[PDB]
Structure 1
């Protein structure tokens, strides 16, 4: 939807708003996924705590890795998101 909106060719206004709405719903689902995986990322932050970096800082950096991973994740892989994410985390 956002790809089609990004193109310069003219689209109908109602169709453009529908595409924007679908992209917004995708954004909402993205944040749903991130909040779901917050627990995994804090677990992996535990896994590297106590090495001179504050635990919440490690959590935040892992969260950066998490947003990267979701930005690079899709169902085309026949695996759960948990297995794929942990590498990027």
Structure 2
């Protein structure tokens, strides 16, 4: 999606393939997010019962978790949970 975001002229079939890869990447974004909904629910129930509703805490942690997945890299050899927990 970064390559197709550029203004350089490429093949239209190549741009279609890049859009397909971008759609697959967005599907991966989703799949990771519904993978980690359970852990953000657990860490939100860790912080409940203090004047703020449970589902509000879950959704705010979900915002923190999409922040986490925006700032996650595979170069460091650690699991997603221990890095996501700080942002949650």
Please tell me the TM-score bracket, short chain as reference: over 0.9
Q: CA deviation at 1:41?
A: 0.1
Give SS of 2:65's match. Answer: helix
What per-residue deviation string (whole Å, max 9, x for no partner) do you get for residues 38-70 of structure 1? 000000001100111100000000000000000
CA RMSD in angstroms comes to 0.5
Residues in 2 aligned to 1:58 and 1:3: alpha-carbon distance in whole angstroms = 33
CA offset digits 1:26-45 (Å, max 9, x no partner): 10011000001000000000
Deviation at 1:76, TM superposition (A): 1.1
Q: Report the CA distance between 1:87 and its aligned residue.
A: 0.4
Q: Tell me how far apart the structure 1 counterparts of residues 77 and 8 of structure 2 sit (CA, whole Å).
A: 36
Figure out how many residues of one structure are paired with residues of the other and give that number: 88
Q: TM-score, normalised by structure 1?
A: 0.97
Counterpart residue number, 1:87? 86
Q: Give the 4+ runs in structure 1 shifted more than 6 A.
A: none
Structure 2 CA distance, aligned partners of 1:22 and 1:86? 29
Aligned runs of 1:55-66 on 2, under 5 Å? Answer: 55-66=54-65
- CA deviation vs aligned residue, 1:4-29 (integer Å, no higher than 9, x gap): 10111101100000000001001001
TM-score, normalised by the number of residues in structure 2:
0.98
* Structure 1 gap ranges (5+): none
Post-superposition offset of 1:77: 1.3
